[PDB]
Design a protein around this nucleic acid. Structure first.
Lengths: 225, 213, 225, 213
RNA sequence: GGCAAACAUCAUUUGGCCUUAAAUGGGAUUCUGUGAGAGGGGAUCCCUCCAUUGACAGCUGGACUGUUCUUUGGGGCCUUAUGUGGUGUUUG
RNA sequence: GGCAAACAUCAUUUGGCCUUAAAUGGGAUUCUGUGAGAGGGGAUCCCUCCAUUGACAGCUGGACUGUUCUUUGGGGCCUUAUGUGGUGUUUG
């Protein structure tokens, strides 16, 4: 019941705007304070803004004051983060979090539930969807070993990317690697699955790649020559 | 404003070992300190509040204590799923401020890597580029060395590697090394191999193939 | 949260009708089965009727079959009992009960919440309001002992009557006896309170009598001769 | 058509004592037996269902067991507030049927009643009747004898009494005896007295008054 | 030197309104598995605060105050945040 | 003798629909103090059912089978009530 759903992230050029929203369930906003906290890639956690919808009171980090404006519409039971005049140094994952209200208190306590977050990257490059290739077994090993297959997702921007297998039906033995930035200023990542050497000749394994920024979706069968 | 100095930055310990992370506050915060666990790519979950109270759904092997303006988090019997980064926060005054974090690696026994090599797809060679992938699956520790040999001559600087986060259940890593070439260069050679040296390998291992078949 | 409030009771002639209703809170009627259970004064428990508002299905005790009709309005979240052709032997307290629905079951379980009930008396007599008299001390004991004073509520019909003292501010030491039926076919009861013998000449002790059947209320201060 | 024969009809036990009420069913009911507690003037609350499971918020000093088609309720450490009538019910088949009930008195030490007598009000005599009230406050056991003597002549047939339910805290009774007369008869005599005999009274107690004093 | 104030520091820390004669806080034993914010609730006992009845003291009334005693009582609706104490420094 | 049905008795007991290769049930150790139906949840091992990939076997291919080995998997939407077995009696 109790959940938070960030939306509104994505790519933006420097100087532009973005309006993230967090849609809450299972509790009334008027009995909490909502917060946006970002995580610069590699850095730790930086609180950004807060709001108590019961009162309408807001507070901002000195690093966004006058560029950002937090708010809430209690009828939609959601909260918003307007981001104006954005800079590169604003690129981060942006979580919204809840602090449950308590009448016995005299200031607010810790952040007791966090949404999964959304990625906001502020850059001058433009979104182009990736390419996807099969990485299929070589059929080297006999009865001693099991075989490995995979997909390669090359030459895309911006982050993030999501990969699945059999629409989520195959998970045991699966590693999706972190993308590494290539010489072209493009990202490239791989996802692999381990399977018994015997299951290749019968089972069909399909990989589901999704790059939501460019509206890109690909399914590729991975079997041998 | 209030500074949360957290130490150590990183540590590794075996399953069952007791673990104490420490967070020192620039000034008085009194009990208004929370501890968060962030597992890679996941949203942080709250563990300890009021310096010592466990949040609902927190295993009892966690605990926190306050000593003046120093605060500690303690895992009395470390578990594999406890691989995470841990963050303190004060909520004594505003703005709320965080510690720098503490990543917690799990130290286990040596596990040899399973190795695979994948030639580039004909679909990629038809795009104008060649990617050759070498896969190091489910080994420990993270320290491993992957060499590339194109007809037995060592390569440097045209490969890139990425490593999984430590698996939260078997505490192993997986590594991916891609050897990226132009299509044309690939048609110049026959033997492509990656050579792996790692702690649980007595002799170093090479997986190879002949071009195509 | 969970409560049931019967209403519709009272005095009724033999041969007449009455329509009890039970107003439920804190749960949906459609996810329970509702029941009426009556208690003849002194006797035990007799199930009367049941209903599953989800299905509309009803069942009745053979002793009311065809005179009574259980029913339910699922929007009002209340349930009803039509009582026709009543007889003297129908006089009782009438409780409604809830049985919580559970999907894993294969028939209905116990009655897990009961309303306080409403009194249904079926008689040929008419409503008569009570008279209230003081029961005052004799002044036998001095400052060592405590004294007793009280109110006598005589010649009323039908049951019940309720007594409080000093508007409910004095509760320790108070006994309201069960009413007894008089040779005149009328009820009569006493309520008493013990107080320190020393406080009589200064403190005020007033009894609050309420006979809701006749819409009668009397406050009578009780002091000695 | 299933009958729940419940026994005993009544019992009394000291605070702290274990108590067992039993209910035997005419035919197989299997676990579909509930047990209810009804306190005077209150609605029954459910205690035991499925013959042995406690409903939420029921003290654990309650329990139930099934033995074939016999079911017993056990209050393992009886408490003063447990004075009630207790009922079994089957819900195996319909119609549902209840036991006849079991009343539970609490046995405490003997306490003699303190006695009070109340002449009729001037406010009532003007209506034609005199009610004389005798009050026996806070005694145990319930058995007490109230005689009315008008000018030292024992009365017959003009008194009625009622007794409170056992106090849910001190486990005592209070009794009220009323002596009803016509104003005319009442004004014929001088001394009005109730004479009480009870277990904790060595000699009988009489509380009296003279009419116009 | 007595103060205010700002700042530092450590420590501690729910805060109101209405009605009322008054509208505290803590301890113990025990019941309650979330049955409405379990940071709960119930029962019973002890202390403490407020009010209150007797008694007693203050010449005696009305008050009013007090007490190693005594009686009876202590309601309702709220709260969405940075108060308070010690120390230091600096200013007026 | 056999098979039904009704009744008696004791015992036991959620029942469907859609998609699907298939859409069971239980046990132990341990974490979870209700997070929204705790009559829960997760983890680890186990047993068990259904299906399934390989192995051995039924001459070999369909197929299909197994007290043995093996891979992997076991979804969704409902439910508002009297089912089932043992025994006895009566009737056809």
């Amino acid at each position: 019941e109790v959940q938070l759903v960030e939306s509104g992230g994505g790519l933006v050029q420097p100087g532009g705007s973005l309006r993230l929203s967090c849609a809450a369930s299972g509790f009334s906003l008027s009995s909490s304070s909502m917060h946006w906290v970002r995580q610069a890639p590699g850095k730790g956690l930086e609180w950004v803004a807060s709001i108590s919808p019961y009162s309408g009171s807001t507070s901002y980090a000195d690093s966004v004051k006058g560029r950002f404006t937090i708010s809430a519409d209690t009828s939609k039971n959601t909260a918003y983060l307007q981001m104006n005049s954005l800079r590169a140094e604003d690129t981060a994952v942006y979580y919204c979090a809840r602090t449950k209200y308590h009448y016995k208190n005299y200031y607010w306590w810790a952040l007791d539930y966090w949404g999964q977050g959304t990625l906001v990257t502020v850059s001058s490059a433009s979104t182009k969807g990736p390419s996807v290739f099969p990485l299929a077994p070589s059929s080297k090993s006999t009865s001693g070993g099991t075989a490995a297959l995979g997909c390669l997702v090359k030459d895309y921007f911006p982050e993030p990317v999501t990969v699945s297998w059999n629409s989520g039906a195959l998970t045991s033995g699966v590693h999706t690697f972190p993308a590494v930035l290539q010489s072209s200023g493009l990202y490239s990542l791989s996802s692999v699955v381990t399977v018994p050497s015997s299951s290749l000749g019968t089972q069909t394994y399909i990989c589901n790649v999704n790059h939501k920024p460019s509206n890109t979706k690909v399914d590729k069968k991975v079997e041998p020559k | 404003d209030i500074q949360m100095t957290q130490s150590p930055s990183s540590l590794s310990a075996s399953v069952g070992d007791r673990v104490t992370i420490t967070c020192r506050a620039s000034q008085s915060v009194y009990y208004s300190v929370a501890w968060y666990q962030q597992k890679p790519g996941k949203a942080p979950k709250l563990l300890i509040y009021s310096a010592s109270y466990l949040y609902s759904g927190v295993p009892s092997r966690f605990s926190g204590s306050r000593s003046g303006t120093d605060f500690t988090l303690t895992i009395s019997s470390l578990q594999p799923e406890d691989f995470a980064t841990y963050y303190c926060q004060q909520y004594r005054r505003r703005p709320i401020t965080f510690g720098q974090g503490t990543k917690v690696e799990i130290k286990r026994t040596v596990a040899a890597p399973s190795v695979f090599i994948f030639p580039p797809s004909d679909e990629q060679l038809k795009s104008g580029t060649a990617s050759v992938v070498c896969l190091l699956n489910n080994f420990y520790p993270r320290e491993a060395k992957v060499q590339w040999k194109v007809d037995n001559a060592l390569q440097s600087g045209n490969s890139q590697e990425s490593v999984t986060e430590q698996d939260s259940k078997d505490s192993t890593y997986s590594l991916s090394s891609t050897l990226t070439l132009s299509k044309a260069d690939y048609e110049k050679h026959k033997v492509y191999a990656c050579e792996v040296t790692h702690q649980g390998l007595s002799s170093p291992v090479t997986k190879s193939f002949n071009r195509g078949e």
